[PDB]
Amino acid sequence: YYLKDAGFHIRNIPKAWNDWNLFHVFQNFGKVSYCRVVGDGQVQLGFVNMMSVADADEVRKNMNDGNLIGENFTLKVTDHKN
Amino acid sequence: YLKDAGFHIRNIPKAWNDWNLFHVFQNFGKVSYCRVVGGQVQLGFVNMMSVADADEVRKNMNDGNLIGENFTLKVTDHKN
Amino acid sequence: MQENMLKISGYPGMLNTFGIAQLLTPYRVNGITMTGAQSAVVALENKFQVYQAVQDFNGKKLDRNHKLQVSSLVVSSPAVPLE
Amino acid sequence: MQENMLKISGYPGMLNTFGIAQLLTPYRVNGITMTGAQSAVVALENKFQVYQAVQDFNGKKLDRNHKLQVSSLVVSSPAVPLE
């Protein structure tokens, strides 16, 4: 169904983003297999699967304590465990 | 046929089969196909898996000669 | 499905459908319809993979005799401007 | 033909037949029959490509969760001993 250790759960996505916005954050680190946003507050949930475990490990190397920090955003990224 | 990936072979020792020819060219890269056509020598044909593999064969030849300890193959590019 | 589809051409005429899929590694290929000796319509898993496959492979020189042309109708469409 | 067939297993369960062909790049794949979630029987173009694919891919680590097993009945059979 999915590739073990290549998936992420995302929190704290700015509410105005769509899936393309989330895609472009993760494409900076590797090839992206799938990407979705899941519309109370100013933030939404999301999911990203990288193309490979190596791609996902490149994301992991660029995180600051589980956070992907942009100029105007901080995504809280956790492994989809399996 | 992949353009620029194939070779005509002359001067193959007559005792060789296709496996003998294959192992000569496998030293330089991946081999797509290979065949011998059998008093002392026979002809053959080798297709490499890509142009880059065939170019690796070409980098290692002395004036169209592929030399071993006990053989000298005469190798030319097949052109269409 | 329109956003899953791309056009690819320029590869060697000898390729079969599996060979065309190998050209698109590592993207997930779900269907290939050959349309000429050197052209095919390809369905990938989703619009993100189509978008990335066009970026990776359009204009890619396979060897000195073959250059890929890859296109689709997929447009990157962020809701807020990229940083 | 027996000498064109190999067995491959251990790749991710998610793969379709196009994904299995991509594993075997650059060899020419002419047929794939999946035999389980992570196993298939594959026909390549000829015995030399089967031989090389077994060498290249048997024991190959795809990632920390997947290792390929690749086998066939193809035996290198030179008529005179190799140098």
Side-chain angles (χ1 to χ4, degrees), chain A residues 1-79 82, chain B residues 1-9 11-13 15-39 41-62 64-73 75-80, chain C residues 1-60 62-68 70-83, chain D:
Chain A
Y1 223 75
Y2 59 97
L3 189 56
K4 177 164 186 295
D5 294 338
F8 297 113
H9 306 316
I10 323 295
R11 302 176 309 162
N12 215 51
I13 300 173
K15 68 178 159 187
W17 290 15
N18 68 352
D19 56 359
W20 276 109
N21 275 115
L22 179 65
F23 167 80
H24 281 294
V25 174
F26 283 75
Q27 193 196 19
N28 281 325
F29 308 113
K31 299 178 178 62
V32 178
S33 161
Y34 186 44
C35 165
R36 174 164 64 88
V37 297
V38 185
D40 158 34
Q42 318 285 85
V43 296
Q44 57 196 319
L45 304 159
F47 305 104
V48 180
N49 301 334
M50 307 305 281
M51 207 53 75
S52 78
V53 171
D55 287 299
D57 285 349
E58 197 49 47
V59 173
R60 286 171 185 122
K61 281 161 40 60
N62 282 272
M63 275 150 60
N64 193 278
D65 209 69
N67 299 307
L68 226 38
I69 307 169
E71 295 193 345
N72 298 282
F73 61 86
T74 302
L75 306 185
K76 296 186 232 191
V77 183
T78 47
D79 297 334
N82 69 110
Chain B
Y1 150 112
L2 179 60
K3 177 169 194 294
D4 294 335
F7 296 111
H8 294 290
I9 323 294
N11 215 52
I12 302 170
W16 291 13
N17 67 353
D18 51 3
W19 278 112
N20 280 112
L21 184 58
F22 162 87
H23 281 293
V24 170
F25 284 74
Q26 193 202 16
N27 281 136
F28 308 109
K30 296 172 177 76
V31 171
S32 186
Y33 183 51
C34 147
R35 180 231 311 145
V36 294
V37 179
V41 281
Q42 49 181 339
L43 315 172
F45 192 87
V46 175
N47 261 124
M48 298 314 278
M49 193 78 51
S50 71
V51 172
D53 289 294
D55 283 350
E56 194 62 30
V57 178
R58 297 180 171 114
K59 291 176 192 344
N60 285 290
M61 281 196 304
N62 308 263
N65 294 314
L66 214 162
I67 55 95
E69 326 184 4
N70 318 272
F71 65 86
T72 303
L73 303 191
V75 187
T76 49
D77 298 331
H78 164 65
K79 319 273 200 198
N80 245 20
Chain C
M1 269 274 213
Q2 195 73 243
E3 54 179 43
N4 295 351
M5 288 164 101
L6 63 80
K7 291 177 70 146
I8 179 167
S9 63
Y11 49 79
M14 66 174 191
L15 263 46
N16 63 21
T17 182
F18 287 122
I20 297 158
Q22 285 165 321
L23 289 177
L24 300 164
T25 306
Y27 298 103
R28 176 155 175 116
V29 175
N30 287 333
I32 300 183
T33 298
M34 306 198 272
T35 56
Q38 296 179 273
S39 67
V41 172
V42 172
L44 304 188
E45 172 69 12
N46 58 48
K47 70 193 168 195
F48 300 113
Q49 302 201 21
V50 167
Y51 173 83
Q52 290 166 102
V54 172
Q55 294 190 316
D56 289 359
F57 304 122
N58 187 41
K60 181 178 172 181
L62 302 181
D63 56 34
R64 61 177 160 270
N65 306 128
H66 299 93
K67 192 173 80 138
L68 295 181
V70 184
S71 62
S72 84
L73 300 173
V74 173
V75 177
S76 157
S77 316
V80 314
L82 296 194
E83 293 190 344
Chain D
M1 300 271 291
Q2 201 72 65
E3 54 177 50
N4 299 340
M5 280 146 66
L6 62 83
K7 294 175 77 131
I8 177 172
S9 63
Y11 48 78
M14 71 179 343
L15 295 192
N16 58 16
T17 58
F18 290 122
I20 297 158
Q22 291 173 328
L23 293 170
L24 299 164
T25 306
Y27 301 105
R28 180 170 175 103
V29 179
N30 289 332
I32 301 175
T33 303
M34 297 182 282
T35 59
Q38 297 181 264
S39 72
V41 174
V42 174
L44 300 189
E45 170 68 23
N46 58 47
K47 71 194 178 199
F48 305 113
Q49 293 193 32
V50 165
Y51 174 86
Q52 292 167 99
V54 168
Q55 292 190 316
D56 286 3
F57 304 128
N58 188 40
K60 180 172 183 183
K61 251 148 209 106
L62 297 181
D63 54 32
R64 61 178 161 268
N65 303 309
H66 297 89
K67 189 165 95 94
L68 297 179
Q69 172 172 337
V70 185
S71 64
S72 80
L73 297 173
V74 174
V75 181
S76 172
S77 309
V80 316
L82 300 187
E83 298 189 337

Short mmCIF file of all heavy atoms in Angstrom, two decimals, chain C residues 11-39:
data_model
loop_
_atom_site.label_atom_id
_atom_site.label_comp_id
_atom_site.label_asym_id
_atom_site.label_seq_id
_atom_site.Cartn_x
_atom_site.Cartn_y
_atom_site.Cartn_z
N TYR C 11 12.35 8.38 -27.18
CA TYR C 11 13.11 7.24 -26.70
C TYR C 11 13.34 6.27 -27.86
O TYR C 11 12.72 6.40 -28.92
CB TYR C 11 12.36 6.57 -25.55
CG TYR C 11 10.89 6.29 -25.82
CD1 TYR C 11 10.51 5.18 -26.58
CD2 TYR C 11 9.88 7.12 -25.31
CE1 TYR C 11 9.18 4.91 -26.84
CE2 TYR C 11 8.52 6.85 -25.57
CZ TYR C 11 8.19 5.74 -26.33
OH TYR C 11 6.88 5.43 -26.61
N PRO C 12 14.22 5.28 -27.69
CA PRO C 12 14.50 4.36 -28.80
C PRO C 12 13.26 3.59 -29.22
O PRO C 12 12.46 3.15 -28.39
CB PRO C 12 15.58 3.44 -28.24
CG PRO C 12 16.26 4.26 -27.21
CD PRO C 12 15.16 5.06 -26.57
N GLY C 13 13.12 3.42 -30.54
CA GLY C 13 11.96 2.74 -31.09
C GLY C 13 11.83 1.31 -30.62
O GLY C 13 10.74 0.75 -30.68
N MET C 14 12.91 0.71 -30.14
CA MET C 14 12.90 -0.68 -29.73
C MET C 14 12.18 -0.93 -28.41
O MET C 14 11.88 -2.07 -28.07
CB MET C 14 14.34 -1.21 -29.62
CG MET C 14 15.13 -0.54 -28.51
SD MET C 14 16.89 -1.33 -28.22
CE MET C 14 17.31 -0.43 -26.55
N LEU C 15 11.94 0.14 -27.65
CA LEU C 15 11.39 -0.02 -26.31
C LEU C 15 10.01 -0.67 -26.35
O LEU C 15 9.18 -0.35 -27.21
CB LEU C 15 11.28 1.34 -25.60
CG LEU C 15 12.42 1.71 -24.65
CD1 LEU C 15 13.79 1.42 -25.26
CD2 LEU C 15 12.32 3.16 -24.17
N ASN C 16 9.77 -1.58 -25.41
CA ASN C 16 8.41 -2.02 -25.13
C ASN C 16 7.87 -1.22 -23.95
O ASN C 16 8.51 -0.30 -23.43
CB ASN C 16 8.35 -3.54 -24.90
CG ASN C 16 9.15 -4.00 -23.68
OD1 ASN C 16 9.46 -3.22 -22.78
ND2 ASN C 16 9.49 -5.29 -23.65
N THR C 17 6.65 -1.56 -23.53
CA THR C 17 6.01 -0.81 -22.46
C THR C 17 6.82 -0.88 -21.17
O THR C 17 6.91 0.11 -20.43
CB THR C 17 4.58 -1.31 -22.24
OG1 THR C 17 3.96 -0.53 -21.23
CG2 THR C 17 4.59 -2.71 -21.76
N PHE C 18 7.41 -2.03 -20.88
CA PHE C 18 8.23 -2.12 -19.67
C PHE C 18 9.45 -1.22 -19.79
O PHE C 18 9.85 -0.59 -18.80
CB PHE C 18 8.65 -3.56 -19.41
CG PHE C 18 7.53 -4.44 -18.92
CD1 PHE C 18 7.19 -5.59 -19.61
CD2 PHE C 18 6.84 -4.13 -17.76
CE1 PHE C 18 6.17 -6.41 -19.15
CE2 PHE C 18 5.83 -4.96 -17.30
CZ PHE C 18 5.49 -6.10 -18.00
N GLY C 19 10.04 -1.13 -20.98
CA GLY C 19 11.18 -0.23 -21.17
C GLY C 19 10.81 1.23 -20.98
O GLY C 19 11.60 2.02 -20.46
N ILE C 20 9.60 1.62 -21.41
CA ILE C 20 9.16 2.99 -21.18
C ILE C 20 8.99 3.25 -19.68
O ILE C 20 9.38 4.32 -19.17
CB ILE C 20 7.87 3.28 -21.97
CG1 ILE C 20 8.14 3.17 -23.48
CG2 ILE C 20 7.33 4.68 -21.64
CD1 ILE C 20 6.87 2.92 -24.33
N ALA C 21 8.44 2.29 -18.95
CA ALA C 21 8.33 2.43 -17.50
C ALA C 21 9.70 2.59 -16.85
O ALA C 21 9.86 3.38 -15.90
CB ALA C 21 7.60 1.23 -16.90
N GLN C 22 10.70 1.86 -17.35
CA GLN C 22 12.04 1.98 -16.78
C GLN C 22 12.62 3.37 -17.02
O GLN C 22 13.39 3.85 -16.19
CB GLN C 22 12.96 0.91 -17.36
CG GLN C 22 12.70 -0.48 -16.80
CD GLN C 22 13.35 -1.58 -17.64
OE1 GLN C 22 13.37 -1.50 -18.87
NE2 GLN C 22 13.88 -2.60 -16.97
N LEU C 23 12.24 4.02 -18.13
CA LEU C 23 12.67 5.40 -18.37
C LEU C 23 12.20 6.34 -17.27
O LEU C 23 12.87 7.34 -16.98
CB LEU C 23 12.13 5.93 -19.70
CG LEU C 23 12.68 5.42 -21.01
CD1 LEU C 23 11.89 6.08 -22.13
CD2 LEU C 23 14.15 5.73 -21.11
N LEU C 24 11.04 6.06 -16.68
CA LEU C 24 10.40 6.95 -15.72
C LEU C 24 10.74 6.62 -14.27
O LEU C 24 10.13 7.19 -13.36
CB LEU C 24 8.89 6.91 -15.92
CG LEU C 24 8.47 7.36 -17.32
CD1 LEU C 24 7.04 6.95 -17.61
CD2 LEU C 24 8.62 8.87 -17.42
N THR C 25 11.66 5.70 -14.03
CA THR C 25 12.10 5.42 -12.68
C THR C 25 12.51 6.73 -12.00
O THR C 25 13.18 7.56 -12.62
CB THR C 25 13.27 4.43 -12.71
OG1 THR C 25 12.88 3.28 -13.46
CG2 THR C 25 13.68 3.99 -11.31
N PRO C 26 12.12 6.95 -10.73
CA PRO C 26 11.41 6.06 -9.82
C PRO C 26 9.90 6.28 -9.71
O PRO C 26 9.30 5.77 -8.75
CB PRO C 26 12.07 6.37 -8.48
CG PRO C 26 12.25 7.88 -8.56
CD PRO C 26 12.48 8.21 -10.04
N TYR C 27 9.30 7.02 -10.63
CA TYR C 27 7.90 7.37 -10.48
C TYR C 27 6.98 6.16 -10.69
O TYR C 27 7.29 5.23 -11.44
CB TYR C 27 7.54 8.51 -11.45
CG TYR C 27 8.36 9.72 -11.09
CD1 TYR C 27 9.47 10.09 -11.85
CD2 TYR C 27 8.08 10.44 -9.94
CE1 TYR C 27 10.24 11.19 -11.49
CE2 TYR C 27 8.85 11.53 -9.57
CZ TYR C 27 9.93 11.90 -10.35
OH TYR C 27 10.69 12.98 -9.95
N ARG C 28 5.85 6.17 -9.99
CA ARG C 28 4.91 5.07 -10.10
C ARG C 28 4.13 5.17 -11.41
O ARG C 28 3.35 6.12 -11.62
CB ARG C 28 3.95 5.02 -8.92
CG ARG C 28 2.92 3.92 -9.13
CD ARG C 28 2.35 3.40 -7.85
NE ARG C 28 1.29 2.42 -8.07
CZ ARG C 28 1.35 1.14 -7.71
NH1 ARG C 28 2.44 0.66 -7.12
NH2 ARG C 28 0.32 0.35 -7.95
N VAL C 29 4.30 4.17 -12.26
CA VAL C 29 3.61 4.09 -13.54
C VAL C 29 2.46 3.10 -13.41
O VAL C 29 2.68 1.95 -13.01
CB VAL C 29 4.58 3.65 -14.65
CG1 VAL C 29 3.85 3.45 -15.98
CG2 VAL C 29 5.72 4.66 -14.77
N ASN C 30 1.25 3.54 -13.74
CA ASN C 30 0.07 2.70 -13.63
C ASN C 30 -0.49 2.26 -14.98
O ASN C 30 -1.31 1.33 -15.02
CB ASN C 30 -1.04 3.42 -12.85
CG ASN C 30 -0.74 3.51 -11.37
OD1 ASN C 30 -0.02 2.66 -10.83
ND2 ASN C 30 -1.24 4.55 -10.72
N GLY C 31 -0.05 2.86 -16.07
CA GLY C 31 -0.51 2.46 -17.38
C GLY C 31 0.27 3.14 -18.48
O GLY C 31 0.72 4.28 -18.31
N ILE C 32 0.47 2.45 -19.60
CA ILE C 32 1.20 2.99 -20.74
C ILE C 32 0.46 2.54 -21.99
O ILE C 32 0.14 1.36 -22.13
CB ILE C 32 2.67 2.50 -20.80
CG1 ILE C 32 3.45 2.92 -19.54
CG2 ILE C 32 3.36 3.04 -22.06
CD1 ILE C 32 4.93 2.52 -19.56
N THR C 33 0.17 3.49 -22.87
CA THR C 33 -0.35 3.18 -24.20
C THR C 33 0.62 3.75 -25.21
O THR C 33 0.81 4.97 -25.27
CB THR C 33 -1.76 3.75 -24.42
OG1 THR C 33 -2.67 3.18 -23.48
CG2 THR C 33 -2.25 3.43 -25.83
N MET C 34 1.23 2.87 -25.99
CA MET C 34 2.15 3.27 -27.05
C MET C 34 1.31 3.89 -28.18
O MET C 34 0.24 3.39 -28.52
CB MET C 34 2.96 2.06 -27.55
CG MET C 34 3.69 1.28 -26.45
SD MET C 34 5.14 0.11 -27.09
CE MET C 34 4.12 -1.52 -27.45
N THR C 35 1.79 4.99 -28.73
CA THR C 35 1.07 5.67 -29.79
C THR C 35 1.88 5.78 -31.07
O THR C 35 1.32 6.19 -32.10
CB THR C 35 0.66 7.06 -29.32
OG1 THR C 35 1.84 7.75 -28.91
CG2 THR C 35 -0.29 6.95 -28.13
N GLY C 36 3.16 5.43 -31.04
CA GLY C 36 4.00 5.34 -32.21
C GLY C 36 5.24 4.57 -31.82
O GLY C 36 5.38 4.14 -30.67
N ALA C 37 6.14 4.40 -32.79
CA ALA C 37 7.40 3.72 -32.52
C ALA C 37 8.18 4.39 -31.39
O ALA C 37 8.89 3.72 -30.65
CB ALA C 37 8.26 3.66 -33.79
N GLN C 38 8.04 5.71 -31.24
CA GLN C 38 8.81 6.46 -30.26
C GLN C 38 7.94 7.41 -29.44
O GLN C 38 8.41 8.46 -29.01
CB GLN C 38 9.93 7.25 -30.94
CG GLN C 38 10.97 6.38 -31.63
CD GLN C 38 12.03 7.23 -32.30
OE1 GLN C 38 11.87 7.65 -33.44
NE2 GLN C 38 13.11 7.52 -31.57
N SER C 39 6.68 7.05 -29.20
CA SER C 39 5.81 7.92 -28.41
C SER C 39 4.78 7.08 -27.67
O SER C 39 4.38 6.01 -28.13
CB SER C 39 5.12 8.98 -29.29
OG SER C 39 4.19 8.37 -30.18
#
